[PDB]
Amino acid sequence: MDVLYSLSKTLKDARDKIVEGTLYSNVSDLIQQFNQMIITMNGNEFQTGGIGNLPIRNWNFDFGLLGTTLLNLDANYVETARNTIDYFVDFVDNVCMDEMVRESQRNGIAPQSDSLRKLSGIKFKRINFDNSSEYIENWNLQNRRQRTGFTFHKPNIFPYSASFTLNRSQPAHDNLMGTMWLNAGSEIQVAGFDYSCAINAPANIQQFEHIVQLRRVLTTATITLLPDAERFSFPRVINSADGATTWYFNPVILRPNNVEVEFLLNGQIINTYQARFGTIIARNFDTIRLSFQLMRPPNMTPAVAALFPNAQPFEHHATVGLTLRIESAVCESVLADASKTMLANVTSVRQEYAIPVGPVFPPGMNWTDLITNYSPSREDNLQRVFTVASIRSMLVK
Amino acid sequence: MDVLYSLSKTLKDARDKIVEGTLYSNVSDLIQQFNQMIITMNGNEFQTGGIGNLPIRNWNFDFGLLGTTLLNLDANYVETARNTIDYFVDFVDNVCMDEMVRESQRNGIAPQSDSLRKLSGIKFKRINFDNSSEYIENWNLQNRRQRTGFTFHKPNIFPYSASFTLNRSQPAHDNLMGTMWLNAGSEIQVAGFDYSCAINAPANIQQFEHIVQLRRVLTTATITLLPDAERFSFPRVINSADGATTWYFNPVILRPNNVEVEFLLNGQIINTYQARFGTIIARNFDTIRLSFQLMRPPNMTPAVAALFPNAQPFEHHATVGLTLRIESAVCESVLADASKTMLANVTSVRQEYAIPVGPVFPPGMNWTDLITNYSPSREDNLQRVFTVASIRSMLVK
Amino acid sequence: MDVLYSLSKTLKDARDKIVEGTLYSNVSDLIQQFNQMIITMNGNEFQTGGIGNLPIRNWNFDFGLLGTTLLNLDANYVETARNTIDYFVDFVDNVCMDEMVRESQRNGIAPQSDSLRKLSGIKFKRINFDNSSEYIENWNLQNRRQRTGFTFHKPNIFPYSASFTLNRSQPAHDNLMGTMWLNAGSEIQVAGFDYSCAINAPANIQQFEHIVQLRRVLTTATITLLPDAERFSFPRVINSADGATTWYFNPVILRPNNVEVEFLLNGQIINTYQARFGTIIARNFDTIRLSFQLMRPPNMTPAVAALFPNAQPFEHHATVGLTLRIESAVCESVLADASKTMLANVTSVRQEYAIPVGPVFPPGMNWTDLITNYSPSREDNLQRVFTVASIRSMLVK
Amino acid sequence: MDVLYSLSKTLKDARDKIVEGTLYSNVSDLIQQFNQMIITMNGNEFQTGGIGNLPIRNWNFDFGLLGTTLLNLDANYVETARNTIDYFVDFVDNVCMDEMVRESQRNGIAPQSDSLRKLSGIKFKRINFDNSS
Amino acid sequence: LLLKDMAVENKNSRDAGKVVDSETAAICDAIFQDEETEGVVRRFIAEMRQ
Ligand SMILES: [Zn+2]
């Protein structure tokens, strides 16, 4: 595999450092590496494709080396080179794609394609070099067993979940108490509502709580926590839990009281914040617990008092909420986020070539389904497949 | 042009790899490249500025080479070097800026300034080197007429558009049906409203649709799709279509029914998603079509039933909506996005030097105006100008 | 200090370019640099830790070098090398962490730890090399007293602030006029409300204004400006200014009239935009001023007219708002943003090792507190500490 | 059959007793046995599968002996060895599985697969060893 | 360079041994006999064939 990597950085640092006008010596160390390749290759033949709509093209090698007597390249030098590169580019593309579609439950962490299986062969190792591309960097460190780690902006850790839980309800749905939320991507919005405005509640306070369990631990997370859940601050007509009817939600928002956010790891509180809105750091956690309360206002102007009567009908529904967004974080496992194109690359190549659903990934590489049941097999396959996508993007975007 | 590039990576990899200490051997390959430059330059004379409030400055060259002697680097070596670099820095800055202001209809792609036009000369080509900077990388591939491509976080593809369309209206605006939306940057929010809650509609369902045509195709897009349009979930007083009066919008939100998102390319459906909220991939498209419905709730608790009478006045306006955000995508054309400073750099240099409006770009480099009428000339000029901004940011931020 | 840097890029470019197979002549220039180090070190003793829950591990040096010889690398070569690297890694980690906790009122910009103070020594300078990591790049340019600069996506310039100002109020809070806002991170949302809908106001227009003073100047900012403040578009029960009671806010939204955004620098208007929504550029500013008005609709349909009576009670509260988001910008001072992990790294190391509160940073490295009173000492310490975090992340994530 | 057995204890006592570090003479008696194998093999082509969803895989043999030298086994020695073992492992697996599914009435105790039938051949017996399992 | 052109007999040991060069040779025969050299030494010297 690592083999593969090189092939590219070779070409990139090539299609880049090899231009009409640079002094030879700026590529002396490079040129070499290159040739070395051609050699090892020539002779051996390859097969790519052979699945879904993916074409089966046959590649063969027969190339002459490169210069050695030059001083600042002449145009002619380039063109005779570029012609050779273009065959490798169009090659790798086909190589990546071919191994970017196969999946395997048993050993879905190793090479699948006839193309790559042949590369892991020993007679090729002679190429590997400059492993600085963040992904390969972590691919190695994992083969030896050590502390990996990636960087993500607005990580996609929460499978889509939009629902509610009625802690107090009745057929008419005219005096409910519970929570409703939206967990998606890197964001959580949760609202706690009490139609009675805690009129009969101890200390006139209703407690709420929202717990979210991550499928993977996030470390070094920079998080924005804000009071209120705008998403649940407007009038709604919602389906009942049993789907038999619809209820009316007419919120009026109050500040969440006694806000406490806990970032836990294996049941232990690692970070805890009491009513701290703005930017907070959660250094290592697999669970987020948001606790907040609705406290009936002890003093009310007439306009406010009018919204909260001592007896039903309760027409204005007291609501308190929180919004939490993970701006950035580090994860030991690959994940989709708001900046990297890996998931999109893998999903796109599979869609374009009409690749049949396999035994590992959910239909369409669906993110929610994937992260919901993020098994070891799916993660190993995802990492292999993401690393290949990153190798491909060095040359083909 | 490519020439220009080098000049910088030369300086960067210079002001970076050259310091009090290190071994010669780590820069041997570098030092050379450098000198090579000085030579080609010396003797030549330049001129930058002259437009608007931009100062005119002349530059000459007559500099000593570099001691290719020592085994290590002594402080003294650096200082005698840094002194020479600083003249080039202050130079390039003035060079960039001077070519970052001029526009041109006929050939808005090639160089403009007396400064650069002279560089494209053959006698200077003896300086190109290490073109791994994403932008130049793509500048070349476009000359050779091949498949380019850039990477963007929250791209800026949608010109600002905030409006509505009343499909059913009357003077009193007391029983409207239509849609309202906000397309801006990488986001779309659209709501469909029916004051009558589909009371007289076939199957008690009102169909809605929102189509957005991109000015450029986006590939590899990672997209967040969520139900509801929070922006259109609150009470509003809006101006009538003819501007003669104002209407009242008092929404109550229901879940969008039969949601279907289609990402089309030249009229063909490339990706289609039915009621799938969360993260979805759109691999290649120039158009987005969002179709959704408002279905009158077949079963209603009293509180809900009360909002939707059989006869006017209709006081609670049934509304369904969708929110779509393009987190990342690839485009073959340069665009502004939420992370890159290119647009801001170009716009800022022009504003600071009071550069007069030209024949190509809209006043103030206005993004909405630019993307709305993204002509080939504007794109070629934008790419030239963005590539220069990126060359400049390697040294001056 | 710069010393430190090298130590890493040494290891990275090492644990990266040294793999079973690669051709020697790709590392010739590298190998050297490496050895050079071992030498300078051997014969030196260090000590890290001693504070809070940070272990006190001791280190010594005495190592053999590396054959330079061999066309290609044999597995055996690596392993005998990796064994030596791992001691340096586990070293640096402890070195970073030890200097990443101490703060000094006086010279919070200079080295602290017994470990590093010893490195700034002259006899170690013989190790410097390849300073291209954005942070160190700027560390130097500053030490020389020159123009710095960084890059941030969704910078964190606004300390959390969520409040209101009642310009007209009375005990019953039944006819208020004022503004409410949320400044946090890179975003500002502000709403102006007038319960009377400007019924007795000159020209039936109520003027509003919101001013935000940045603690540091931002240049090259790409900004999204949109009409409406969704956060303040829903019903709320709010505490009175004196905390003695609660008032009711029942907004109905109208388009903000005569919107004018000014980006000022030292009291001077640098950029001004009149009613321009979408993407705008603010090239250099330390203050943002948003002015907008509520204009009573001159023509109203019955439904609208009904919301705005000539006499109290005023039950629907006319509200106009704006939303402004700084997507990206450059700052001469380090700041937290939505992508970089620096703040989180520093905060996390301190939390994990139970580092006691010091004399410079607020408890918990609280961002709001830090940016609110961003003194020169806090900035120098923050930069030192952020630069170290970035050096560490090259090897340990 | 017994043949088969060896193939493994060979590999186990191999992937086990052969590691970065060990002194020479702890593999002398072993090393030998190993090589002896490679020889007998090289040249003969094999075939596994062909039934149900069992992939028809082709196997070929052409591996160099060993550097019966170095004192305290250098890392490099191992890796060049492990690479050869892994082909045999992935082999045997396929060999076992292929004969672990065929049934025969008349004479059901004997070997079935084209893979194994070929092993019971005399020219291979030169391998059997350590039947303590 | 080539080695056959430097071949030499490792006087001691069972498998016809031909070591690198003269010095290589000397040393072996030399140590072989310094009785205070771990049993592993003779062994290695021994069996190690070209
Ligand atoms: Zn963002």
Side-chain angles (χ1 to χ4, degrees), chain A residues 29-30 32-33 36 122 125-132 134 137-138 140-141 144 146-154 219-222 224-230 233-234 251-255 270-271 273 276-284 297 299-304 307-308 316 323 325 327-330 339, chain C residues 12-13 15-17 19-23 25-26 28-29 71-73 79 82 86 153-154 156 160 162 171-174 182 184-185 187 189 230-232 234-239 243-249 336-341 343-345 347-349 351-352 363-364 366-369 392-397:
Chain A
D29 299 302
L30 181 60
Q32 289 294 69
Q33 164 68 51
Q36 165 71 59
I122 179 62
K125 193 74 71 174
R126 286 187 170 292
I127 318 177
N128 217 18
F129 106 119
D130 207 10
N131 293 183
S132 52
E134 192 188 1
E137 202 198 314
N138 285 295
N140 277 308
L141 302 180
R144 310 167 44 188
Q146 270 177 46
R147 212 187 181 190
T148 51
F150 316 60
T151 291
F152 315 60
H153 166 48
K154 272 179 72 179
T219 300
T220 300
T222 300
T224 295
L225 196 257
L226 297 167
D228 302 337
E230 302 173 14
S233 297
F234 51 82
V252 61
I253 306 301
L254 289 73
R255 47 149 229 124
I270 299 302
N271 291 103
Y273 295 101
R276 187 165 331 247
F277 304 114
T279 297
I280 62 193
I281 305 303
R283 68 178 149 102
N284 192 171
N299 285 301
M300 300 183 291
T301 55
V304 175
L307 307 164
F308 311 121
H316 298 275
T323 292
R325 305 198 303 264
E327 307 298 349
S328 59
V330 172
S339 298
Chain C
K12 179 192 176 70
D13 264 45
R15 185 159 66 183
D16 294 325
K17 285 184 172 122
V19 296
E20 176 192 1
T22 176
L23 194 171
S25 66
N26 309 316
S28 62
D29 299 302
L71 193 63
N72 296 78
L73 301 183
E79 288 300 314
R82 271 173 173 171
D86 288 317
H153 158 52
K154 266 182 80 179
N156 201 323
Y160 178 87
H173 290 81
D174 60 347
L182 165 72
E187 182 177 325
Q189 277 191 60
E230 302 173 15
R231 180 172 194 83
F232 305 117
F234 50 82
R236 294 180 174 269
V237 166
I238 304 159
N239 70 0
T245 189
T246 53
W247 45 290
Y248 179 48
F249 183 42
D337 78 345
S339 298
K340 300 190 180 180
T341 58
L343 175 66
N345 283 307
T347 305
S348 293
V349 171
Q351 287 175 355
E352 183 184 358
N366 181 256
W367 190 246
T368 284
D369 294 346
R392 176 171 173 257
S393 180
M394 287 167 73
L395 296 174
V396 170
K397 288 205 288 155

Side-chain angles (χ1 to χ4, degrees), chain A residues 47-68:
Chain A
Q47 271 191 306
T48 68
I51 189 176
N53 270 323
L54 191 55
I56 319 164
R57 300 170 194 172
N58 270 63
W59 319 93
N60 201 303
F61 300 60
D62 49 352
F63 293 60
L65 281 187
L66 300 180
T68 300

